[PDB]
Design a protein around this ligand. Structure first.
Ligand SMILES: CCCCCCCCCCCCCCCCCC(=O)OC[C@H](CO[C@@H]1O[C@H](CO[C@H]2O[C@H](CO)[C@H](O)[C@H](O)[C@H]2O)[C@H](O)[C@H](O)[C@H]1O)OC(=O)CCCCCCCCCCCCCCCCC
Ligand code: CLA
Ligand code: CLA
Ligand code: CLA
Ligand code: CLA
Ligand code: CLA
Ligand SMILES: CCCCCCCCCCCCCCCC(=O)OC[C@H](CO[C@@H]1O[C@H](CS(=O)(=O)O)[C@@H](O)[C@H](O)[C@H]1O)OC(=O)CCCCCCCCCCCCCCC
Ligand SMILES: CCCCCCCCCCCCCCCC(=O)OC[C@H](COP(=O)(O)OC[C@@H](O)CO)OC(=O)CCCCCCCCCCCCCCC
Ligand SMILES: CC1=C(/C=C/C(C)=C/C=C/C(C)=C/C=C/C=C(C)/C=C/C=C(C)/C=C/C2=C(C)CCCC2(C)C)C(C)(C)CCC1
Ligand SMILES: CC1=C(/C=C/C(C)=C/C=C/C(C)=C/C=C/C=C(C)/C=C/C=C(C)/C=C/C2=C(C)CCCC2(C)C)C(C)(C)CCC1
Ligand SMILES: CCCCCCCCCCCCCCCCCC(=O)O
Ligand SMILES: CCCCCCCCCCCCCCCCCC(=O)O
Ligand SMILES: CCCCCCCCCCCCCCCCCC(=O)O
Ligand SMILES: [Fe+2]
Lengths: 505, 36, 34, 82, 63, 31, 115, 39, 32, 30, 341, 57, 33
């Protein structure tokens, strides 16, 4: 009978049961979304959006509800910290319940369409055979996609009739859902301009409405119809897969690099913010300004928001994880409790020293301190017998400004060393390692896991495009080549054009 | 009014052996990483 | 009665004439002293 | 079969072939030799001569460190060799 | 086969199986739009790549 | 540049030499 | 060592003390096994590409071959006609015995050099 | 407002068009002269 | 050794679920 | 538990070897 | 008979080197990737991007020449010749790494054209396109290693450079930084490549040693006619031999040759997936249970802990020279070293 | 004690290994190329410590 | 709640093993008819 890898081909000439199979898949996907959200709701801790945001907690679908405006729970908390809010039906719980109900209704529709497969709508009036007019279906479905895309941009994103979308400042400190006006200028194409997302959907939606109308009304030319086997539904599978892996590579890209649609308060920082010391420069800028206004070192560093220091820490860098280090980031370094303050290192000569930071490539990294000029002035040596730069020799001390340790100074070498070992990770934080039995090993964030899964799925779907693209164009020889194939066709010299039997001699 | 498109499926004994071998060897490979 | 200029002719010469030029360049390099 | 071109064994044993390529091959070889001996290849590609890797008393490498100022950086390294 | 009220209403939308415009039809017009789209995707990519830099377009989180 | 013409000189010679030795048989290549 | 990670330790220490990557016999061993995998795929795909139609599309094409049958199940002239055009006509085998001897010789000689 | 890189973008766009245009010009011409015979 | 506790069930189902699938297909092939 | 799991899987494979060899579908000249 | 059909006739003429529509993409890009590599390894330096010599002109040999990746300060720039970094200056383009993206991008499109060629030729000749399908694994490998991997890292600097010894450096980097030998996707890739070499050698040897005597000469190659209908070796005797030598044997000639396609193709695909992981540093670097025990128990040692100590040596001893843009200054006293060495 | 420096390397599943890290460990460097059958050991315990099984295998 | 961890594997196999047995027997019955 059929090989195990071909069981689903019985749907190829059965549009009714193909719809049933497609309904069942949709019911399965919507059920997953509902289930996933309920599981995240049962485990999410909303009590600290500063040091314990969703992306430290392994939340995966929670940020996608929050991105488009679902921000609060029926139990009265919102992910922006406000207590005593009333979100109405469209809470996290309401969204989940809505997907569960949707799943069960699609399940019943699937049953009906599987039993009543022999609908006259699916049979060609001329020939009585099952037939689908795929050029016209594409026109209908394209028209609908355009309407939905326009409507989503014109109403939901603008706030004309809808909540808007997540927007934030450049350092992810003050995000919230806000209506967004379209940016129609050249900056609309800047992936970091959220106005471009609105304009895109308005414009593209209209183009889709128009193209949809064209494809409902104008038949494909005979040349293109034959070239692309438009009477064979597998040609659609082949091009649909191609479009889908194209989309998958794009979302993997924008998740890894960042854009207005992948904000850092929902998915965590990018690795490039660590590479360019993006948060550290902004922190330094604010410290400089306060010292200008005649603030003390203690006052200037105390003015730094804990949320901003927390971004300047390599444990939030998504390129620090491992493929089999599972779970939330809190399972690794622990649940962050407080900023300890900014550590300043000085040698016996009073000169300020700076710990060289760990680059994301390195699982481990030595502890090296340089001066403003980059001259090495202290380190923790491996071989002790000929060391010149040890902390004991150089009289290294550490003082904290801001945070919990504000105004403290440690001079004993063991303590100064353990703080220097943390400063290679950036700002130093207090962590609760007990609650989750954390093991001390960095994990990646949802941005990392999203990017990995979608880059991998995209690559596999390329193979699916190639496979179904070949079965479309080579359907005539799928079961083998012609048993009476002539050597004249395949040997050289007989035909002036390869394959064309009319070009003899 | 039965559906004309139904087909029997087959798996011969050799394919069972090959398939069982694939699964067991894949389990033997990844189990260390699952336990971590 | 064979053609002298064919697609084949262009193909073999697109490779061959740069190759000999490069061999001469590399040969001369064996005499560069520092 | 044959797709219509002259056989290769035919061409290379032919006198007309060697007449033509007794000149072209050595000429191309000489042109390449000259390309390096005139020093031209250094200037086309920007490859350091043995004396222009470092300035006389410097031990650091002229690494480009800016994306858009890059061409500018290389030219400044080059003028410090004078 | 089986007739339904909904089937009858939708029936015209699934009735022109295999009907084609003669010859090349709108193929030249499609090629124009494809070429336009190519150039437009090129601009989007090169902006994101910082290979094409436009006044007032600062491809950075600071935006 | 004087280095550009010395490098090209044997190439131009080798090109003109082959064209003069095949010109009858190439002109005969017709249509 | 007789272990998975032990093999890796052996390989790393070997590179340290012999620079095996820069040794031409190992470079020949890599051509041997890369080449063998390449030619394994080539030969598999070319014979598979020219199987003679013997089955319908609801059955495995493998049922087109019966254990012990006298005739071949693929058209080597078709495979040569495809592969000769993919490269050029003489880069392709038309002698099955020459082709299969090549399949044996390349990885075997390669792995002799790496051993 | 044309930037230096926008001018570079157009340079490469027109460079691409010429290279592609010359290619299909040569090939169409050759295809017209050296035709295939059908009896 | 302090291993991941869910690794046992993950390994167990990794084996059982695809294995049972094959066995089901094979036994029904034999009985027809 | 992990030791038992590794050995269990290994032992199933050896059992599969036995059936694959001694209880194969016999190749028949057909 | 429009101009399109006339162009189609000439493109598909049976000539010594078949062209086709796919030839329009394949030949320009393949020739320029090839020629770009030869040009760079002969004449072009890596001094300004890497601090390295890399051409014959500088005194390198075939093993040490490379077209090296651009500097890390270029990020993922396309490095167009007319783009904002080189600004049309060919000499500066070469010095900044432009030949690397030049080879990598023309090479990607050349690979596309080669696969389209396999489809085109298979369709004209009337054979199934399984060979085009097999070629997706080299494409998977090329895209994952040369494009996806550096796109997830800081810049093109960390992609493989195009050279023999440069690729060896890549190998060792992946051991010391990614612990890539421990990765099960690479382990499946290894199995597929060595298993493909195994299948290649065992199948060729089996056929050569179960041949029928179809001639009288001692060289057996002449006793084969490509148009003969009959098998040239004995499947029945081959099967009995391996059944009694090894326990099992192939009995289906079609399954055998499909298996030879499947094994190495699947192997390369699996290894590609593991490299996509490494783009994000999602390594299989450690075993957590081993680290917890080792940290508490100074007498616990396995080949896993021994290999990490090696990785730590690779990283610290090779990083300052391998990533010169970082300006790593590691004093001698911090370099990890065992006794005496 | 693979390296003959009294630093035993654990290779077996029961002593904290998994499939990927486990191994039969090569025999002691103190033995060099000397033949070390079971019957040259004073006890099985000695033979195990010094890597006897590797030679046998 | 501090539940017995093996409770999960015990429950899963308790469901899976006899259910799979029944499914095997049912499907090969159907392909007889
Ligand atoms: C199989 C089929 C085979 C087909 C063969 C394909 C042949 C076609 C060749 C395609 C060439 C692709 C080049 C893409 C270059 C790219 O990406 O270039 C990268 C740029 C992003 O630029 C990078 O941006 C980074 C983030 O910066 C941001 O962050 C900084 C703060 O940290 C500052 O704010 C900065 O200003 C701000 O821009 C750093 O700055 C880097 O240095 C800079 O290079 O994106 C962009 O061009 C576009 C980003 C949109 C995504 C496009 C998808 C392509 C990528 C898919 C793979 C991504 C997944 C890989 C895994 C991860
Ligand atoms: C004023 C009108 C307007 C405005 C302001 C926008 C604004 C935008 N559009 Mg939209 N667009 C419009 C009209 C408009 N659009 C119209 C009328 C259409 C036609 C219907 C489109 C069609 C369109 C498409 C098809 C896409 C956009 C995208 C975008 C975004 C670009 C920024 C970005 O993240 O790119 C990021 C995307 C790119 C830089 C391009 C990716 C190209 C890569 C190189 C392809 C690689 C393919 C290859 C197989 C993969 C190889 C893998 C290997 C290299 C790793 C932005 C929101 C892009 C988007 O949504 O991005 C999130 C996008 O893909 N637009
Ligand atoms: C009935 C309508 C409806 C509504 C309002 C929602 C709303 C929501 N869903 Mg649910 N969903 C629905 C139906 C719905 N869903 C159905 C039917 C399914 C089953 C398939 C799901 C399955 C599902 C999953 C699996 C998940 C959600 C999630 C979500 C949330 C985020 C949505 C998001 O980011 O989308 C993003 C959507 C897109 C980016 C659309 C992609 C558009 C591409 C570009 C298509 C391009 C092709 C097109 C033809 C081109 C046209 C060309 C142009 C010119 C017009 C949000 C609360 C997420 C969540 O939080 O779950 C808890 C989530 O993970 N949903
Ligand atoms: C797009 C898919 C996607 C992504 C990106 C995420 C991402 C995430 N999830 Mg979610 N999840 C998903 C789908 C996804 N999930 C689905 C479909 C389910 C239903 C099962 C869940 C159920 C779920 C739970 C129950 C939990 C998460 C959690 C998490 C987080 C940690 C994940 C982790 O440790 O990974 C571990 C990943 C791996 C170890 C990778 C495994 C891949 C192996 C190697 C299999 C492939 C081998 C294969 C057999 C090869 C065969 C080869 C053959 C051809 C020969 C992270 C934010 C956790 C969290 O923190 O929640 C709060 C959590 O507890 N998720
Ligand atoms: C929209 C996506 C899509 C759709 C609708 C199809 C549909 C089809 N495929 Mg294609 N295919 C796709 C994507 C898709 N494919 C991709 C991405 C790949 C590359 C990996 C392939 C590779 C492929 C091959 C190589 C073959 C098909 C075949 C088939 C046909 C029979 C499938 C069957 O019976 O499976 C039955 C499958 C099973 C009984 C079990 C498969 C279990 C898999 C291996 C793991 C379990 C997955 C799990 C549920 C996770 C869900 C996936 C989700 C996360 C994305 C059918 C028309 C076959 C064909 O052409 O027949 C003529 C065939 O030979 N497909
Ligand atoms: C198959 C041919 C081919 C292909 C695919 C490529 C591809 C590429 N080359 Mg290469 N190149 C080629 C041949 C080719 N080249 C040849 C023959 C030469 C020798 C002169 C070169 C010399 C060369 C150099 C020196 C460089 C490249 C570069 C590049 C890259 C950037 C190109 C770019 O941005 O184009 C932009 C141009 C276009 C996309 C063409 C646009 C086409 C028109 C304008 C569309 C207009 C629409 C119109 C209305 C529709 C009409 C419809 C019709 C029916 C009439 C890219 C990877 C660059 C590179 O590698 O950088 C790292 C680079 O520096 N190429
Ligand atoms: C700045 C641009 C300047 C143009 C450079 C080209 C750039 C575009 C790349 C396309 C070049 C490939 C075409 C090959 C030219 C050729 O030899 O045929 C073109 C003709 C005809 O050759 C014919 O060759 C034919 C055999 S075949 O088609 O070449 O295989 C044969 O049919 C015929 O009888 C014979 O006369 O040959 C000549 O031009 C002789 C001079
Ligand atoms: C079998 C092993 C194969 C190795 C083959 C060595 C040939 C050995 C062989 O068996 O045949 C040798 C073959 C015989 O040529 P003739 O038939 O002209 O020779 C007459 C002889 O029979 C008398 O000795 O010569 C060639 O074809 C040389 C090939 C050079 C071809 C150079 C073409 C350059 C084109 C570039 C490549 C095209 C693009 C590639 C695809 C992208
Ligand atoms: C009937 C009904 C109802 C109900 C409903 C329900 C109850 C539903 C549910 C549903 C659900 C509850 C569903 C779910 C689903 C799920 C899913 C679908 C899953 C999937 C998964 C997967 C697929 C996975 C995979 C994997 C793994 C495992 C590992 C890793 C990798 C991956 C991810 C691939 C109501 C009352 C409403 C109405 C009326 C009727
Ligand atoms: C990049 C570029 C380009 C292109 C270029 C080209 C196209 C080039 C070519 C080039 C070439 C094309 C070259 C070649 C060379 C070659 C050579 C250099 C060879 C050598 C060889 C040898 C040495 C061999 C020998 C041997 C051995 C070793 C062993 C065995 C035996 C024999 C004899 C085989 C252009 C213009 C666009 C502009 C832009 C840039
Ligand atoms: C109860 C408090 C909030 C008020 C409810 C708002 C009304 C519900 C709006 C939900 C969004 C629906 C638009 C999604 C697309 C609709 C068309 C469709 O796809 O079927
Ligand atoms: C600011 C820029 C200054 C301009 C300097 C001139 C550089 C232009 C050289 C471009 C040569 C053609 C390369 C691209 C042609 C191929 C593109 C394609 O075929 O798709
Ligand atoms: C950019 C311009 C380069 C030209 C692009 C060539 C693309 C042509 C692909 C057609 C290959 C035909 C494969 C399908 C078939 O005929 O079986
Ligand atoms: Fe064979």
């Amino acid at each position: 009978g059929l090989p195990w890898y071909r069981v689903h081909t019985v749907l190829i000439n059965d549009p009714g049961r193909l719809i049933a199979a497609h309904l069942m898949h949709t019911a399965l996907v919507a059920g997953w979304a509902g289930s996933m959200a309920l599981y995240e709701l049962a485990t999410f801790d909303p009590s600290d959006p500063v040091l314990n945001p969703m992306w430290r907690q392994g939340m995966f679908v929670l940020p996608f509800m929050a991105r488009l405006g679902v921000t609060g729970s029926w139990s009265g908390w919102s992910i922006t910290g406000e207590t005593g809010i009333d979100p109405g039906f469209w809470s996290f719980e309401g969204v989940a319940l809505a997907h569960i109900v949707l799943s069960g209704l699609l399940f019943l529709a699937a049953c009906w369409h599987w039993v009543y497969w022999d609908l006259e709508l699916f049979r060609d009036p001329r020939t009585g055979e099952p037939a689908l007019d795929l050029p016209k279906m594409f026109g209908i479905h394209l028209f609908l996609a355009g309407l939905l895309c326009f409507g989503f941009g014109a109403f939901h994103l603008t706030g004309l009739f809808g909540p808007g979308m997540w927007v934030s400042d450049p350092y992810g400190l003050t995000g919230s859902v806000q209506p967004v006006a379209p940016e129609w200028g050249p900056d609309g194409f800047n992936p970091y301009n959220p106005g471009g997302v609105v304009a895109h959907h308005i414009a593209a939606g209209i183009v889709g409405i128009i193209a949809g109308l064209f494809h409902i009304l104008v038949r494909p030319p005979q040349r293109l119809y034959k070239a692309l086997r438009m009477g064979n539904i597998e040609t659609v599978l082949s091009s649909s897969i191609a479009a889908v892996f194209f989309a998958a590579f794009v979302v993997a890209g924008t998740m890894w690099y960042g854009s207005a649609t992948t904000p850092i308060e929902l998915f965590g920082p990018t690795r490039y913010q660590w590479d360019s010391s993006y948060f550290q420069q902004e922190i330094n800028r604010r410290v400089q300004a306060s010292l200008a206004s005649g603030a003390t070192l203690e006052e200037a560093w105390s003015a730094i928001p804990e949320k901003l220091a927390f971004y300047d820490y390599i444990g939030n860098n998504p390129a620090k994880g491992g493929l089999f280090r599972t779970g939330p980031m809190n399972k690794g370094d622990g649940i962050a409790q407080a900023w300890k303050g900014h550590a300043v290192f000085r040698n016996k000569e009073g000169e300020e020293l700076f710990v060289r930071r760990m680059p994301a490539f390195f699982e481990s990294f030595p502890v090296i301190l340089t001066d403003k000029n980059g001259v090495v002035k202290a380190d923790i040596p491996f071989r002790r017998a000929e060391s010149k730069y040890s902390f004991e020799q150089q009289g290294v001390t550490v003082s904290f400004y801001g945070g919990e340790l504000n105004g403290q100074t440690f001079t004993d070498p063991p303590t100064v060393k353990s703080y220097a070992r943390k400063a290679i990770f950036g700002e130093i934080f207090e962590f609760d390692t007990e609650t989750l039995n954390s093991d001390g090993i960095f994990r990646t964030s949802p941005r990392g896991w999203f990017t990995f899964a979608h880059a991998v799925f995209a690559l596999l779907f390329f193979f699916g495009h190639i496979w179904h693209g070949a079965r479309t164009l080579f359907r005539d020889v799928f079961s083998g080549i012609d048993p009476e194939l002539s050597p004249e066709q395949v040997e050289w010299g007989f035909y002036q054009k390869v394959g064309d039997v009319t070009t003899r001699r | 009014e039965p559906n004309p498109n139904r087909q029997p499926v087959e798996l011969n004994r050799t394919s069972l052996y090959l398939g069982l071998l694939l699964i067991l060897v894949l389990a033997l490979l990844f189990s260390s990483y699952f336990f971590n | 009665s064979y053609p002298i200029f064919t697609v084949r002719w262009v193909a073999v010469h697109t490779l061959a004439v740069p190759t000999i030029f490069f061999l001469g360049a590399i040969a001369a390099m064996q005499f560069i002293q520092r | 079969g044959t797709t219509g071109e002259r056989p290769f064994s035919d061409i290379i044993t032919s006198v007309r072939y060697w007449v033509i390529h007794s000149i072209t091959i050595p000429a191309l070889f000489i042109a390449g030799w000259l390309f390096v001996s005139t020093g031209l290849a250094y200037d086309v590609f920007g490859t350091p001569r043995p004396d222009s890797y470092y300035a006389q008393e410097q031990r650091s490498i002229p690494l480009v460190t800016d994306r858009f100022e890059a061409k500018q950086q290389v030219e400044t390294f080059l003028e410090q060799l004078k | 086969a089986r007739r339904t009220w909904l089937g009858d209403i939708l029936r015209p939308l699934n009735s022109e199986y295999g009907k084609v415009a003669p010859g090349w039809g709108t193929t030249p017009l499609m090629a124009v739009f494809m070429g336009l789209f190519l150039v437009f995707l090129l601009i989007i990519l090169e902006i994101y790549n910082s290979t094409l830099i436009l006044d007032g377009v600062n491809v950075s989180w600071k935006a | 540049d004087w280095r550009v013409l010395v490098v090209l000189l044997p190439v131009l010679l080798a090109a003109g030499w082959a064209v003069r030795n095949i010109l009858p048989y190439a002109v005969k290549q017709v249509q | 060592p007789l272990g998975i990670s032990g093999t890796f330790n052996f390989m790393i220490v070997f590179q340290a003390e012999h620079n095996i990557l820069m040794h031409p016999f190992h470079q020949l061993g890599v051509a041997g096994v890369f080449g063998g995998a390449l030619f394994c795929a080539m030969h598999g795909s070319l014979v598979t590409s020219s199987l003679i139609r013997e089955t319908t599309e609801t059955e495995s094409a493998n049922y087109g071959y019966k254990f012990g049958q006298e005739e071949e199940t693929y058209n080597i002239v078709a495979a040569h006609g495809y592969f000769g055009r993919l490269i050029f006509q003489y880069a392709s085998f038309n002698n099955s015995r020459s082709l299969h001897f090549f399949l044996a010789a390349w990885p075997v000689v390669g792995v002799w050099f790496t051993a | 407002t044309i930037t230096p890189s926008l001018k570079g973008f157009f340079i490469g766009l027109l460079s691409g068009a010429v290279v592609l245009g010359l290619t299909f010009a040569v090939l169409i011409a050759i295809s017209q002269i050296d035709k295939v015979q059908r009896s | 050794m302090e291993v991941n506790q869910l690794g046992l069930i993950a390994t167990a189902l990794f084996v059982l679920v695809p294995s049972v699938f094959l066995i089901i297909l094979y036994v029904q092939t034999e009985s027809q | 538990m992990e030791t038992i799991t590794y050995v269990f899987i290994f032992a199933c494979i050896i059992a599969l070897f036995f059936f694959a060899i001694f209880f194969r579908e016999p190749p028949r000249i057909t | 008979r429009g101009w399109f059909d006339i162009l189609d006739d000439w493109l598909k003429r049976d000539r010594f080197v078949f062209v086709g529509w796919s030839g329009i993409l394949l030949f320009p890009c393949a020739y320029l990737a090839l020629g770009g590599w030869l040009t760079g390894t002969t004449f072009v330096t890596s001094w300004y991007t890497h601090g390295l010599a890399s051409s014959y002109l500088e005194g390198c040999n075939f093993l040490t020449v490379a077209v090296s990746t651009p500097a890390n300060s270029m990020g993922h720039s396309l490095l167009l010749l007319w783009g904002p970094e080189a600004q049309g200056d060919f000499t500066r383009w070469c010095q900044l790494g432009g030949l690397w993206t030049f080879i990598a991008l023309h090479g990607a499109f050349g690979l596309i054209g080669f696969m389209l060629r396999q489809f085109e030729i298979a369709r004209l000749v009337g054979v199934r396109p399984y060979n085009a399908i097999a070629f997706s694994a080299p494409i998977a490998v090329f895209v994952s290693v040369f494009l996806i991997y550096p796109l997830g890292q800081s810049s093109w600097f960390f992609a493989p450079s195009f050279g023999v010894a440069a690729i060896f450096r890549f190998l060792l980097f992946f051991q010391g930084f990614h612990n890539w030998t421990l990765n099960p996707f690479h382990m499946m890739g290894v199995a597929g490549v060595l298993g493909g070499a195994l299948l290649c050698a065992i199948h060729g040897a089996t056929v050569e040693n179960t041949l029928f005597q179809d001639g009288e000469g001692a060289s057996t190659f002449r006793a084969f006619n490509p148009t003969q209908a009959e098998e040239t070796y004995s499947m029945v005797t081959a099967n009995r031999f391996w059944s009694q030598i090894f326990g099992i044997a192939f009995s289906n000639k079609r399954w055998l040759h499909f298996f030879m396609l499947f094994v190495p193709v699947t192997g390369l695909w699996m290894s590609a997936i593991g490299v996509v992981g490494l783009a994000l540093n999602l390594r299989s670097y450690d075993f957590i249970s081993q680290e917890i025990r080792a940290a508490e128990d100074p007498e616990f040692e396995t080949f896993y802990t021994k290999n990490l100590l090696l990785n730590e040596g690779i990283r610290a001893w090779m990083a300052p020279q391998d990533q010169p843009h970082e300006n790593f200054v590691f004093p001698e006293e911090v370099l990890p070293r065992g006794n005496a060495l | 004690d693979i390296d003959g420096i009294r630093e035993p390397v654990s290779g077996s599943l029961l002593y904290g290994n998994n499939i990927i890290t486990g191994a039969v460990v090569p025999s002691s460097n103190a033995i060099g190329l000397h033949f070390y059958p079971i019957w040259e050991a004073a006890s099985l315990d000695e033979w195990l410590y010094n890597g006897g099984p590797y030679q046998l295998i």
